[PDB]
Amino acid sequence: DVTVVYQNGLPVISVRLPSRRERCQFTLKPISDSVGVFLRQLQEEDRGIDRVAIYSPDGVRVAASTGIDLLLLDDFKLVINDLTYHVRPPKRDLLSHENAATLNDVKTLVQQLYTTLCIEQHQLNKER
Amino acid sequence: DVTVVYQNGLPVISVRLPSRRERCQFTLKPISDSVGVFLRQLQEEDRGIDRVAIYSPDGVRVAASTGIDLLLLDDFKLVINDLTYHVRPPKRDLLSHENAATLNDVKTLVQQLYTTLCIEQHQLNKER
Amino acid sequence: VINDLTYHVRPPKRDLLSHENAATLNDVKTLVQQLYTTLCIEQHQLNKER
Amino acid sequence: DVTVVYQNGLPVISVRLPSRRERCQFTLKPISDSVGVFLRQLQEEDRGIDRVAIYSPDGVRVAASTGIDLLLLDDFKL
Amino acid sequence: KPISDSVGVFLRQLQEEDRGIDRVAIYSPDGVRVAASTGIDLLLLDDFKL
Amino acid sequence: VINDLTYHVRPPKNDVKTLVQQLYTTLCIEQHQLNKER
């Protein structure tokens, strides 16, 4: 299969390469990678890949100029030399379409991480 | 059948290509992107395009270094090898009377949160 | 993997970071990026210079 | 449809191309040319062509050093 | 040259000098376009449209 | 090491807690400037 899971703030995508029947993972930096660089990286990793492409689920191809972060919002399909793989677990969570509660969900986590690490003691330690 | 859709605040053009007869979609940037490399992207996506042009519905031609902001207010005619399409884009509404003071505040706070996180790579990457 | 070998390497671990903190920091680092993509702050940032 | 005509003692292949919709003909010499020369020539004709394969009546592929007279004995898939 | 020259590269030398290169082509007399990379001896053995 | 001999040469001779502090101080100064102003 082809799947995507978040490791350490970055989406690691696991993919099944055609040659050697073995899987490879890809850690791609989404805010500055485009979907052309990712296909160049797949063809770098396994030169026997002839055709590789990304299909939006209307049958329409997504061109090689968009961002990764746009491409991981809603699902898509990935076509290697003749096989397809529809991929759905990017786990889009934005059912809110809001501003205030979505930003309160940031500092709900930030203050919880701010308590348990003795950070005010760390600031006073550096000042001392 | 060229169509322009606004997805997440960005224009997406759905062009039909002559080689693989598939609908493909390009995600444009309004300000930073221009026609002069939009045509380069349409050259990159299909090698089979011999010559491609695009111009205004009254004038003869529009040249390179023309912004998508200036083209996208008007309709325009598109020319692939033996095909001439013409497309109006839809017109975006406005919400910048009341909700702008909340929307721009959310944008400023999330951009501060982005540049808080992205900076530790960039400081070392600039130092070396 | 050198040609017909399998060198199994165990590097000395020096992280020392607790696991409960890591998922919360991961959720922050993903949600900030996802909201940065959600409403195109790169384009609004580029608008002010214009 | 793609057909082969023996004109003047030589096979001539008429192919409709994907990029520009014409029907171009290819004249090739069975004493020198090979499969890998004919598909390289068809690749040089266009640019929108990206994958090419001469198969068999069976599912197997014909390589890029087979002579043309060893190809034109039977029907084939392009 | 009869045998070592190609149609699609003789037309390059024909088109690099002049100015009217809206269309330069060689067709079969039934409207079929000949390939560019075919030879000259294969072409001049029969008739053609220039 | 050149062909035979030896030249021994002697020449003239927390990273997450700071990031979460920089991340916390973005959510705070937006209120703190209006606090300090009035």
From Swiss-Prot, chain E:
Phosphorylation by CaMK2 in heart leads to increased MCU current. The regulation of MCU by CaMK2 is however subject to discussion: another group was unable to reproduce these results. Phosphorylated on tyrosines by PTK2B/PYK2, promoting oligomerization. It is found in: Mitochondrion inner membrane. It comes from the Eukaryota. Changing residue 22 to R: No effect on calcium uptake in presence of high concentrations of calcium. Abolished dimerization of MCU. Induction: MCU transcripts are down-regulated by microRNA miR-25. Down-regulation by miR-25 may protect cardiomyocytes against oxidative damage in cardiomyocytes. Homotetramer. Component of the uniplex complex, composed of MCU, EMRE/SMDT1, MICU1 and MICU2 (or MICU3) in a 4:4:1:1 stoichiometry. Interacts with CCDC109B/MCUB; this inhibits channel activity. Interacts with MCUR1. Interactions with MICU1 and MCUR1 are mutually exclusive. Interacts with SLC25A23. Belongs to the MCU (TC 1.A.77) family. Channel-forming and calcium-conducting subunit of the mitochondrial inner membrane calcium uniporter complex (uniplex), which mediates calcium uptake into the mitochondrial matrix. MCU channel activity is regulated by the calcium-sensor subunits of the uniplex MICU1 and MICU2 (or MICU3). Mitochondrial calcium homeostasis plays key roles in cellular physiology and regulates ATP production, cytoplasmic calcium signals and activation of cell death pathways. Involved in buffering the amplitude of systolic calcium rises in cardiomyocytes. The selectivity filter, in which calcium ions are arranged in single file, is composed of two acidic rings separated by one helical turn along the central axis of the channel pore. This is Calcium uniporter protein, mitochondrial. It comes from Homo sapiens. The gene is MCU.
